[PDB]
PDB file of C-alpha atoms and ligand atoms in Angstrom:
ATOM      1  CA  UNK A   1      14.819  28.311  86.095  1.00  0.00           C
ATOM      2  CA  UNK A   2      12.860  31.512  85.319  1.00  0.00           C
ATOM      3  CA  UNK A   3       9.869  31.636  82.955  1.00  0.00           C
ATOM      4  CA  UNK A   4       8.704  34.067  80.241  1.00  0.00           C
ATOM      5  CA  UNK A   5       5.439  33.055  78.643  1.00  0.00           C
ATOM      6  CA  UNK A   6       5.749  29.457  77.501  1.00  0.00           C
ATOM      7  CA  UNK A   7       9.601  29.564  77.684  1.00  0.00           C
ATOM      8  CA  UNK A   8      12.132  29.102  80.483  1.00  0.00           C
ATOM      9  CA  UNK A   9      15.800  29.779  80.958  1.00  0.00           C
ATOM     10  CA  UNK A  10      18.509  29.758  83.586  1.00  0.00           C
ATOM     11  CA  UNK A  11      20.936  32.544  84.478  1.00  0.00           C
ATOM     12  CA  UNK A  12      23.653  29.884  84.844  1.00  0.00           C
ATOM     13  CA  UNK A  13      23.663  29.475  81.046  1.00  0.00           C
ATOM     14  CA  UNK A  14      25.015  32.837  79.886  1.00  0.00           C
ATOM     15  CA  UNK A  15      25.775  32.576  76.169  1.00  0.00           C
ATOM     16  CA  UNK A  16      26.493  36.234  75.528  1.00  0.00           C
ATOM     17  CA  UNK A  17      26.764  39.683  77.046  1.00  0.00           C
ATOM     18  CA  UNK A  18      27.303  43.281  76.083  1.00  0.00           C
ATOM     19  CA  UNK A  19      27.042  46.582  77.880  1.00  0.00           C
ATOM     20  CA  UNK A  20      23.288  46.657  77.286  1.00  0.00           C
ATOM     21  CA  UNK A  21      22.152  43.021  77.348  1.00  0.00           C
ATOM     22  CA  UNK A  22      22.807  39.526  78.619  1.00  0.00           C
ATOM     23  CA  UNK A  23      21.645  36.400  76.817  1.00  0.00           C
ATOM     24  CA  UNK A  24      20.770  33.019  78.385  1.00  0.00           C
ATOM     25  CA  UNK A  25      20.049  29.626  76.878  1.00  0.00           C
ATOM     26  CA  UNK A  26      16.559  28.349  77.480  1.00  0.00           C
ATOM     27  CA  UNK A  27      13.797  26.285  75.980  1.00  0.00           C
ATOM     28  CA  UNK A  28      10.079  25.952  75.458  1.00  0.00           C
ATOM     29  CA  UNK A  29       8.395  24.805  78.691  1.00  0.00           C
ATOM     30  CA  UNK A  30       6.407  22.149  76.759  1.00  0.00           C
ATOM     31  CA  UNK A  31       8.707  21.084  73.854  1.00  0.00           C
ATOM     32  CA  UNK A  32      11.953  20.867  75.862  1.00  0.00           C
ATOM     33  CA  UNK A  33      14.000  20.158  72.739  1.00  0.00           C
ATOM     34  CA  UNK A  34      13.065  23.573  71.183  1.00  0.00           C
ATOM     35  CA  UNK A  35      15.970  25.698  72.404  1.00  0.00           C
ATOM     36  CA  UNK A  36      15.846  29.493  72.588  1.00  0.00           C
ATOM     37  CA  UNK A  37      18.011  32.403  73.535  1.00  0.00           C
ATOM     38  CA  UNK A  38      16.524  34.767  76.099  1.00  0.00           C
ATOM     39  CA  UNK A  39      17.810  38.319  76.018  1.00  0.00           C
ATOM     40  CA  UNK A  40      17.538  40.348  79.220  1.00  0.00           C
ATOM     41  CA  UNK A  41      18.477  43.732  80.623  1.00  0.00           C
ATOM     42  CA  UNK A  42      22.030  44.308  81.738  1.00  0.00           C
ATOM     43  CA  UNK A  43      21.512  45.853  85.183  1.00  0.00           C
ATOM     44  CA  UNK A  44      24.812  47.806  85.097  1.00  0.00           C
ATOM     45  CA  UNK A  45      23.050  50.092  82.554  1.00  0.00           C
ATOM     46  CA  UNK A  46      19.429  49.546  83.428  1.00  0.00           C
ATOM     47  CA  UNK A  47      17.740  52.482  81.677  1.00  0.00           C
ATOM     48  CA  UNK A  48      19.620  52.359  78.385  1.00  0.00           C
ATOM     49  CA  UNK A  49      19.459  48.530  78.305  1.00  0.00           C
ATOM     50  CA  UNK A  50      15.703  48.701  78.765  1.00  0.00           C
ATOM     51  CA  UNK A  51      15.400  51.289  75.938  1.00  0.00           C
ATOM     52  CA  UNK A  52      17.489  49.260  73.510  1.00  0.00           C
ATOM     53  CA  UNK A  53      15.663  45.981  74.122  1.00  0.00           C
ATOM     54  CA  UNK A  54      12.400  47.843  73.522  1.00  0.00           C
ATOM     55  CA  UNK A  55      13.773  49.185  70.198  1.00  0.00           C
ATOM     56  CA  UNK A  56      14.940  45.739  69.133  1.00  0.00           C
ATOM     57  CA  UNK A  57      11.464  44.317  69.666  1.00  0.00           C
ATOM     58  CA  UNK A  58       9.923  47.006  67.432  1.00  0.00           C
ATOM     59  CA  UNK A  59      12.400  46.294  64.601  1.00  0.00           C
ATOM     60  CA  UNK A  60      12.693  42.511  64.803  1.00  0.00           C
ATOM     61  CA  UNK A  61       9.000  41.971  64.947  1.00  0.00           C
ATOM     62  CA  UNK A  62       8.910  43.336  61.353  1.00  0.00           C
ATOM     63  CA  UNK A  63      11.709  41.134  59.988  1.00  0.00           C
ATOM     64  CA  UNK A  64      11.152  37.478  59.099  1.00  0.00           C
ATOM     65  CA  UNK A  65      14.029  35.998  57.175  1.00  0.00           C
ATOM     66  CA  UNK A  66      16.077  32.831  57.335  1.00  0.00           C
ATOM     67  CA  UNK A  67      19.235  34.951  57.671  1.00  0.00           C
ATOM     68  CA  UNK A  68      17.932  37.132  60.551  1.00  0.00           C
ATOM     69  CA  UNK A  69      17.597  35.671  64.060  1.00  0.00           C
ATOM     70  CA  UNK A  70      13.906  34.961  64.663  1.00  0.00           C
ATOM     71  CA  UNK A  71      11.927  36.663  67.477  1.00  0.00           C
ATOM     72  CA  UNK A  72       9.642  33.944  68.829  1.00  0.00           C
ATOM     73  CA  UNK A  73       8.190  36.023  71.666  1.00  0.00           C
ATOM     74  CA  UNK A  74       8.849  38.960  73.933  1.00  0.00           C
ATOM     75  CA  UNK A  75       7.488  40.492  77.088  1.00  0.00           C
ATOM     76  CA  UNK A  76       7.712  44.219  77.667  1.00  0.00           C
ATOM     77  CA  UNK A  77       6.467  45.851  80.894  1.00  0.00           C
ATOM     78  CA  UNK A  78       7.128  49.152  82.700  1.00  0.00           C
ATOM     79  CA  UNK A  79      10.081  47.799  84.669  1.00  0.00           C
ATOM     80  CA  UNK A  80      11.212  44.748  82.712  1.00  0.00           C
ATOM     81  CA  UNK A  81      11.865  43.499  79.155  1.00  0.00           C
ATOM     82  CA  UNK A  82      12.682  40.051  77.697  1.00  0.00           C
ATOM     83  CA  UNK A  83      13.153  38.851  74.138  1.00  0.00           C
ATOM     84  CA  UNK A  84      12.811  35.182  73.252  1.00  0.00           C
ATOM     85  CA  UNK A  85      14.851  34.440  70.155  1.00  0.00           C
ATOM     86  CA  UNK A  86      16.081  31.624  67.969  1.00  0.00           C
ATOM     87  CA  UNK A  87      19.029  29.726  69.437  1.00  0.00           C
ATOM     88  CA  UNK A  88      21.896  29.330  66.947  1.00  0.00           C
ATOM     89  CA  UNK A  89      23.824  26.191  67.933  1.00  0.00           C
ATOM     90  CA  UNK A  90      27.128  27.325  66.290  1.00  0.00           C
ATOM     91  CA  UNK A  91      27.652  30.454  68.358  1.00  0.00           C
ATOM     92  CA  UNK A  92      28.997  33.679  66.867  1.00  0.00           C
ATOM     93  CA  UNK A  93      31.369  34.357  63.996  1.00  0.00           C
ATOM     94  CA  UNK A  94      33.827  36.053  66.321  1.00  0.00           C
ATOM     95  CA  UNK A  95      34.550  32.819  68.228  1.00  0.00           C
ATOM     96  CA  UNK A  96      34.534  30.805  64.978  1.00  0.00           C
ATOM     97  CA  UNK A  97      37.196  33.090  63.490  1.00  0.00           C
ATOM     98  CA  UNK A  98      39.229  32.980  66.701  1.00  0.00           C
ATOM     99  CA  UNK A  99      39.386  29.173  66.282  1.00  0.00           C
ATOM    100  CA  UNK A 100      39.743  28.965  62.494  1.00  0.00           C
ATOM    101  CA  UNK A 101      42.087  32.036  62.265  1.00  0.00           C
ATOM    102  CA  UNK A 102      40.999  32.610  58.653  1.00  0.00           C
ATOM    103  CA  UNK A 103      38.312  31.271  56.356  1.00  0.00           C
ATOM    104  CA  UNK A 104      38.576  29.986  52.828  1.00  0.00           C
ATOM    105  CA  UNK A 105      37.187  32.116  50.014  1.00  0.00           C
ATOM    106  CA  UNK A 106      34.538  29.454  49.338  1.00  0.00           C
ATOM    107  CA  UNK A 107      33.290  29.700  52.930  1.00  0.00           C
ATOM    108  CA  UNK A 108      33.459  33.554  52.847  1.00  0.00           C
ATOM    109  CA  UNK A 109      31.308  33.397  49.723  1.00  0.00           C
ATOM    110  CA  UNK A 110      28.736  31.127  51.359  1.00  0.00           C
ATOM    111  CA  UNK A 111      28.550  33.263  54.472  1.00  0.00           C
ATOM    112  CA  UNK A 112      28.434  36.539  52.574  1.00  0.00           C
ATOM    113  CA  UNK A 113      25.690  35.324  50.223  1.00  0.00           C
ATOM    114  CA  UNK A 114      23.487  34.878  53.322  1.00  0.00           C
ATOM    115  CA  UNK A 115      24.490  38.215  54.869  1.00  0.00           C
ATOM    116  CA  UNK A 116      23.611  39.788  51.493  1.00  0.00           C
ATOM    117  CA  UNK A 117      20.172  38.066  51.584  1.00  0.00           C
ATOM    118  CA  UNK A 118      19.481  39.581  55.026  1.00  0.00           C
ATOM    119  CA  UNK A 119      20.716  43.007  53.843  1.00  0.00           C
ATOM    120  CA  UNK A 120      18.377  42.830  50.823  1.00  0.00           C
ATOM    121  CA  UNK A 121      15.445  42.696  53.210  1.00  0.00           C
ATOM    122  CA  UNK A 122      16.752  45.449  55.537  1.00  0.00           C
ATOM    123  CA  UNK A 123      17.395  47.688  52.528  1.00  0.00           C
ATOM    124  CA  UNK A 124      13.888  47.037  51.029  1.00  0.00           C
ATOM    125  CA  UNK A 125      12.312  47.818  54.427  1.00  0.00           C
ATOM    126  CA  UNK A 126      14.472  50.990  54.851  1.00  0.00           C
ATOM    127  CA  UNK A 127      16.177  49.722  57.978  1.00  0.00           C
ATOM    128  CA  UNK A 128      19.850  50.183  58.866  1.00  0.00           C
ATOM    129  CA  UNK A 129      21.455  47.848  61.451  1.00  0.00           C
ATOM    130  CA  UNK A 130      24.455  49.981  62.647  1.00  0.00           C
ATOM    131  CA  UNK A 131      26.267  47.330  64.733  1.00  0.00           C
ATOM    132  CA  UNK A 132      27.396  44.678  62.251  1.00  0.00           C
ATOM    133  CA  UNK A 133      30.435  42.824  63.555  1.00  0.00           C
ATOM    134  CA  UNK A 134      31.450  39.162  63.970  1.00  0.00           C
ATOM    135  CA  UNK A 135      30.097  39.162  67.588  1.00  0.00           C
ATOM    136  CA  UNK A 136      26.592  39.823  66.104  1.00  0.00           C
ATOM    137  CA  UNK A 137      26.716  37.282  63.305  1.00  0.00           C
ATOM    138  CA  UNK A 138      25.441  33.828  64.365  1.00  0.00           C
ATOM    139  CA  UNK A 139      25.995  30.364  62.940  1.00  0.00           C
ATOM    140  CA  UNK A 140      23.652  27.378  62.953  1.00  0.00           C
ATOM    141  CA  UNK A 141      24.355  23.798  61.811  1.00  0.00           C
ATOM    142  CA  UNK A 142      21.276  21.859  60.525  1.00  0.00           C
ATOM    143  CA  UNK A 143      28.387  18.964  58.779  1.00  0.00           C
ATOM    144  CA  UNK A 144      30.221  21.125  56.272  1.00  0.00           C
ATOM    145  CA  UNK A 145      30.756  24.829  55.305  1.00  0.00           C
ATOM    146  CA  UNK A 146      27.997  24.573  52.675  1.00  0.00           C
ATOM    147  CA  UNK A 147      25.426  23.717  55.332  1.00  0.00           C
ATOM    148  CA  UNK A 148      26.207  26.445  57.958  1.00  0.00           C
ATOM    149  CA  UNK A 149      23.350  28.971  58.072  1.00  0.00           C
ATOM    150  CA  UNK A 150      24.306  32.460  59.122  1.00  0.00           C
ATOM    151  CA  UNK A 151      22.001  34.946  60.808  1.00  0.00           C
ATOM    152  CA  UNK A 152      22.351  38.577  61.661  1.00  0.00           C
ATOM    153  CA  UNK A 153      21.562  39.427  65.290  1.00  0.00           C
ATOM    154  CA  UNK A 154      21.437  42.340  67.783  1.00  0.00           C
ATOM    155  CA  UNK A 155      19.119  44.993  66.322  1.00  0.00           C
ATOM    156  CA  UNK A 156      19.187  47.289  69.397  1.00  0.00           C
ATOM    157  CA  UNK A 157      20.845  50.114  67.460  1.00  0.00           C
ATOM    158  CA  UNK A 158      18.852  49.541  64.261  1.00  0.00           C
ATOM    159  CA  UNK A 159      16.539  52.256  62.936  1.00  0.00           C
ATOM    160  CA  UNK A 160      14.287  53.130  60.047  1.00  0.00           C
ATOM    161  CA  UNK A 161      15.947  55.625  57.761  1.00  0.00           C
ATOM    162  CA  UNK A 162      13.849  57.262  55.057  1.00  0.00           C
ATOM    163  CA  UNK A 163      15.535  57.003  51.689  1.00  0.00           C
ATOM    164  CA  UNK A 164      16.063  60.776  51.335  1.00  0.00           C
ATOM    165  CA  UNK A 165      17.333  61.310  54.908  1.00  0.00           C
ATOM    166  CA  UNK A 166      20.631  60.791  56.779  1.00  0.00           C
ATOM    167  CA  UNK A 167      21.305  59.503  60.293  1.00  0.00           C
ATOM    168  CA  UNK A 168      23.669  61.157  62.757  1.00  0.00           C
ATOM    169  CA  UNK A 169      23.586  59.096  65.921  1.00  0.00           C
ATOM    170  CA  UNK A 170      27.026  57.977  67.087  1.00  0.00           C
ATOM    171  CA  UNK A 171      26.537  54.277  67.813  1.00  0.00           C
ATOM    172  CA  UNK A 172      28.098  50.915  66.954  1.00  0.00           C
ATOM    173  CA  UNK A 173      31.494  49.280  67.478  1.00  0.00           C
ATOM    174  CA  UNK A 174      34.407  51.644  66.590  1.00  0.00           C
ATOM    175  CA  UNK A 175      36.592  49.041  64.867  1.00  0.00           C
ATOM    176  CA  UNK A 176      33.623  48.290  62.508  1.00  0.00           C
ATOM    177  CA  UNK A 177      32.132  51.803  62.181  1.00  0.00           C
ATOM    178  CA  UNK A 178      32.313  53.455  58.779  1.00  0.00           C
ATOM    179  CA  UNK A 179      34.611  56.522  58.817  1.00  0.00           C
ATOM    180  CA  UNK A 180      31.656  58.962  58.490  1.00  0.00           C
ATOM    181  CA  UNK A 181      30.069  57.427  61.615  1.00  0.00           C
ATOM    182  CA  UNK A 182      33.143  57.576  63.835  1.00  0.00           C
ATOM    183  CA  UNK A 183      33.953  61.105  62.622  1.00  0.00           C
ATOM    184  CA  UNK A 184      30.505  62.313  63.816  1.00  0.00           C
ATOM    185  CA  UNK A 185      29.202  63.025  60.280  1.00  0.00           C
ATOM    186  CA  UNK A 186      25.886  62.199  58.633  1.00  0.00           C
ATOM    187  CA  UNK A 187      25.541  58.695  57.175  1.00  0.00           C
ATOM    188  CA  UNK A 188      23.129  56.362  55.470  1.00  0.00           C
ATOM    189  CA  UNK A 189      22.736  52.652  54.797  1.00  0.00           C
ATOM    190  CA  UNK A 190      26.166  52.484  53.135  1.00  0.00           C
ATOM    191  CA  UNK A 191      27.718  52.680  56.564  1.00  0.00           C
ATOM    192  CA  UNK A 192      26.633  49.043  57.067  1.00  0.00           C
ATOM    193  CA  UNK A 193      28.481  48.088  53.835  1.00  0.00           C
ATOM    194  CA  UNK A 194      31.773  49.347  55.350  1.00  0.00           C
ATOM    195  CA  UNK A 195      31.116  47.189  58.372  1.00  0.00           C
ATOM    196  CA  UNK A 196      30.464  44.207  56.133  1.00  0.00           C
ATOM    197  CA  UNK A 197      33.669  44.876  54.165  1.00  0.00           C
ATOM    198  CA  UNK A 198      35.550  44.922  57.462  1.00  0.00           C
ATOM    199  CA  UNK A 199      34.069  41.540  58.492  1.00  0.00           C
ATOM    200  CA  UNK A 200      34.930  40.023  55.120  1.00  0.00           C
ATOM    201  CA  UNK A 201      38.507  41.373  55.290  1.00  0.00           C
ATOM    202  CA  UNK A 202      38.862  39.951  58.824  1.00  0.00           C
ATOM    203  CA  UNK A 203      37.556  36.541  57.659  1.00  0.00           C
ATOM    204  CA  UNK A 204      40.100  36.541  54.797  1.00  0.00           C
ATOM    205  CA  UNK A 205      43.241  37.752  56.614  1.00  0.00           C
ATOM    206  CA  UNK A 206      42.536  37.277  60.323  1.00  0.00           C
ATOM    207  CA  UNK A 207      43.141  40.981  60.924  1.00  0.00           C
ATOM    208  CA  UNK A 208      41.558  44.428  60.789  1.00  0.00           C
ATOM    209  CA  UNK A 209      42.055  46.327  57.481  1.00  0.00           C
ATOM    210  CA  UNK A 210      43.153  49.452  59.381  1.00  0.00           C
ATOM    211  CA  UNK A 211      45.081  48.723  62.587  1.00  0.00           C
ATOM    212  CA  UNK A 212      44.658  51.110  65.490  1.00  0.00           C
ATOM    213  CA  UNK A 213      45.559  51.041  69.179  1.00  0.00           C
ATOM    214  CA  UNK A 214      42.269  52.711  70.247  1.00  0.00           C
ATOM    215  CA  UNK A 215      38.969  54.205  68.925  1.00  0.00           C
ATOM    216  CA  UNK A 216      40.411  57.739  69.084  1.00  0.00           C
ATOM    217  CA  UNK A 217      43.514  56.533  67.226  1.00  0.00           C
ATOM    218  CA  UNK A 218      41.335  55.027  64.479  1.00  0.00           C
ATOM    219  CA  UNK A 219      39.320  58.218  64.124  1.00  0.00           C
ATOM    220  CA  UNK A 220      42.516  60.290  63.851  1.00  0.00           C
ATOM    221  CA  UNK A 221      43.767  57.865  61.203  1.00  0.00           C
ATOM    222  CA  UNK A 222      40.578  58.305  59.168  1.00  0.00           C
ATOM    223  CA  UNK A 223      40.587  62.131  59.569  1.00  0.00           C
ATOM    224  CA  UNK A 224      44.209  62.402  58.425  1.00  0.00           C
ATOM    225  CA  UNK A 225      44.017  59.930  55.501  1.00  0.00           C
ATOM    226  CA  UNK A 226      41.734  61.214  52.754  1.00  0.00           C
ATOM    227  CA  UNK A 227      42.163  57.951  50.798  1.00  0.00           C
ATOM    228  CA  UNK A 228      41.873  54.522  52.493  1.00  0.00           C
ATOM    229  CA  UNK A 229      43.287  51.568  50.653  1.00  0.00           C
ATOM    230  CA  UNK A 230      43.439  48.207  52.486  1.00  0.00           C
ATOM    231  CA  UNK A 231      46.306  45.796  51.817  1.00  0.00           C
ATOM    232  CA  UNK A 232      45.030  42.812  49.819  1.00  0.00           C
ATOM    233  CA  UNK A 233      47.054  39.557  49.941  1.00  0.00           C
ATOM    234  CA  UNK A 234      48.467  38.318  46.653  1.00  0.00           C
ATOM    235  CA  UNK A 235      46.580  35.005  47.004  1.00  0.00           C
ATOM    236  CA  UNK A 236      43.208  36.842  46.870  1.00  0.00           C
ATOM    237  CA  UNK A 237      40.963  36.056  43.932  1.00  0.00           C
ATOM    238  CA  UNK A 238      40.370  38.969  41.555  1.00  0.00           C
ATOM    239  CA  UNK A 239      36.570  39.183  42.353  1.00  0.00           C
ATOM    240  CA  UNK A 240      37.201  39.189  46.123  1.00  0.00           C
ATOM    241  CA  UNK A 241      39.922  41.844  45.688  1.00  0.00           C
ATOM    242  CA  UNK A 242      37.551  44.064  43.744  1.00  0.00           C
ATOM    243  CA  UNK A 243      34.691  43.604  46.251  1.00  0.00           C
ATOM    244  CA  UNK A 244      36.893  44.451  49.229  1.00  0.00           C
ATOM    245  CA  UNK A 245      38.293  47.568  47.485  1.00  0.00           C
ATOM    246  CA  UNK A 246      34.730  48.596  46.590  1.00  0.00           C
ATOM    247  CA  UNK A 247      33.291  48.221  50.143  1.00  0.00           C
ATOM    248  CA  UNK A 248      36.298  49.657  52.008  1.00  0.00           C
ATOM    249  CA  UNK A 249      36.149  53.163  50.499  1.00  0.00           C
ATOM    250  CA  UNK A 250      36.463  56.021  52.953  1.00  0.00           C
ATOM    251  CA  UNK A 251      33.822  58.314  51.463  1.00  0.00           C
ATOM    252  CA  UNK A 252      30.277  57.056  51.422  1.00  0.00           C
ATOM    253  CA  UNK A 253      29.445  58.670  48.085  1.00  0.00           C
ATOM    254  CA  UNK A 254      32.241  56.657  46.470  1.00  0.00           C
ATOM    255  CA  UNK A 255      31.517  53.397  48.371  1.00  0.00           C
ATOM    256  CA  UNK A 256      29.825  50.429  46.665  1.00  0.00           C
ATOM    257  CA  UNK A 257      26.051  50.740  46.808  1.00  0.00           C
ATOM    258  CA  UNK A 258      23.513  48.034  47.651  1.00  0.00           C
ATOM    259  CA  UNK A 259      22.702  47.111  44.024  1.00  0.00           C
ATOM    260  CA  UNK A 260      26.442  46.725  43.226  1.00  0.00           C
ATOM    261  CA  UNK A 261      26.981  44.593  46.332  1.00  0.00           C
ATOM    262  CA  UNK A 262      24.001  42.297  45.777  1.00  0.00           C
ATOM    263  CA  UNK A 263      25.035  41.665  42.168  1.00  0.00           C
ATOM    264  CA  UNK A 264      28.805  41.479  42.648  1.00  0.00           C
ATOM    265  CA  UNK A 265      30.426  38.563  40.740  1.00  0.00           C
ATOM    266  CA  UNK A 266      32.092  37.274  43.924  1.00  0.00           C
ATOM    267  CA  UNK A 267      28.646  36.256  45.200  1.00  0.00           C
ATOM    268  CA  UNK A 268      27.758  34.145  42.127  1.00  0.00           C
ATOM    269  CA  UNK A 269      27.168  30.419  42.824  1.00  0.00           C
TER     270      UNK A 269
HETATM  271  O1  LIG B   1      23.311  38.374  71.000  1.00  0.00           O
HETATM  272  C1  LIG B   1      24.434  38.807  71.247  1.00  0.00           C
HETATM  273  N1  LIG B   1      25.546  38.179  70.853  1.00  0.00           N
HETATM  274  C2  LIG B   1      25.555  36.902  70.157  1.00  0.00           C
HETATM  275  C3  LIG B   1      25.785  35.745  71.111  1.00  0.00           C
HETATM  276  C4  LIG B   1      24.614  35.569  72.092  1.00  0.00           C
HETATM  277  N2  LIG B   1      23.346  35.402  71.432  1.00  0.00           N
HETATM  278  C5  LIG B   1      22.937  34.276  70.813  1.00  0.00           C
HETATM  279  N3  LIG B   1      23.657  33.139  70.982  1.00  0.00           N
HETATM  280  C6  LIG B   1      23.201  32.048  70.352  1.00  0.00           C
HETATM  281  N4  LIG B   1      23.920  30.917  70.448  1.00  0.00           N
HETATM  282  C7  LIG B   1      25.139  30.593  71.100  1.00  0.00           C
HETATM  283  C8  LIG B   1      25.991  31.539  71.657  1.00  0.00           C
HETATM  284  C9  LIG B   1      27.165  31.123  72.264  1.00  0.00           C
HETATM  285  C10 LIG B   1      27.462  29.769  72.333  1.00  0.00           C
HETATM  286  C11 LIG B   1      26.671  28.816  71.719  1.00  0.00           C
HETATM  287  C12 LIG B   1      26.952  27.336  71.890  1.00  0.00           C
HETATM  288  N5  LIG B   1      27.951  26.634  71.077  1.00  0.00           N
HETATM  289  C13 LIG B   1      28.553  25.522  71.815  1.00  0.00           C
HETATM  290  C14 LIG B   1      29.367  24.659  70.891  1.00  0.00           C
HETATM  291  O2  LIG B   1      30.262  25.362  70.013  1.00  0.00           O
HETATM  292  C15 LIG B   1      29.751  26.583  69.484  1.00  0.00           C
HETATM  293  C16 LIG B   1      29.032  27.419  70.505  1.00  0.00           C
HETATM  294  C17 LIG B   1      25.480  29.237  71.130  1.00  0.00           C
HETATM  295  N6  LIG B   1      22.063  31.960  69.623  1.00  0.00           N
HETATM  296  C18 LIG B   1      21.358  33.095  69.499  1.00  0.00           C
HETATM  297  C19 LIG B   1      21.762  34.284  70.084  1.00  0.00           C
HETATM  298  C20 LIG B   1      21.049  35.572  69.825  1.00  0.00           C
HETATM  299  C21 LIG B   1      20.200  36.303  70.806  1.00  0.00           C
HETATM  300  C22 LIG B   1      19.593  35.695  69.590  1.00  0.00           C
HETATM  301  C23 LIG B   1      24.664  40.096  71.987  1.00  0.00           C
HETATM  302  C24 LIG B   1      25.295  40.003  73.391  1.00  0.00           C
HETATM  303  C25 LIG B   1      24.286  41.047  73.887  1.00  0.00           C
HETATM  304  C26 LIG B   1      23.461  40.844  72.605  1.00  0.00           C
HETATM  305 MG1  LIG B   2      21.631  47.051  65.893  1.00  0.00          MG
HETATM  306 MG1  LIG B   3      26.942  56.466  54.928  1.00  0.00          MG
END
């Protein structure tokens, strides 16, 4: 049982890991029933892990939204970094999908409405996330689909991007990267919309819209195919079909923009 401020956690209770972080369940040292997630360095990549946790603090401390994982506290020092975040009792969307295989359109709508709410804030603040994928989408139960709250997590790759500028850093998860990202081209906040389209497609079908055996294979596929058209099942509602075809466009200038996404009829209640 280690401590960080007025919080504690145990390294026995690993609830997530990536190349640049590990996350442990914990709680407030005084209100033991207030659970938290404590994100720590991954020591197999000490220097980059430390950098990325530092970056995440700077972003997340500016974002307060019911559909973004809350930062309760943090502690940054020369040789160590911890973030103390909201614990989401439903775990990640990746494990939920693995169990459920596919989600109903009604549940996709409820989840995507919340993702869209979070993206509204990011877009107004001029922040791009750059690593949206089911592993980084969290669920919390307060019960049914209509009560699951979803939260975007893992802002270590996120950056401010001025509205007249483009980003060029190669980062993210290849199977969810927009084509312009994985092909080492400039990109903007519409790269996140491709990622979101990919998540939605995966929720609907249980599979990736563009199958590949490796990252390099996927890049070659994008380079060689100047038009990208996902297969849409016949059972798909006409609004969800249109939304998926709008988000999963190869070329960012053609892709759905934020205003189109936020107002798309699929998201109407
Ligand atoms: O944060 C990441 N991935 C998401 C999973 C780990 N993180 C979290 N897990 C959780 N919750 C959680 C994760 C896995 C399992 C569970 C417990 N449930 C048990 C019952 O059935 C559902 C899962 C809960 N809440 C918040 C967080 C994030 C840091 C603020 C990345 C891994 C390096 C960063
Ligand atoms: Mg990020
Ligand atoms: Mg772009």
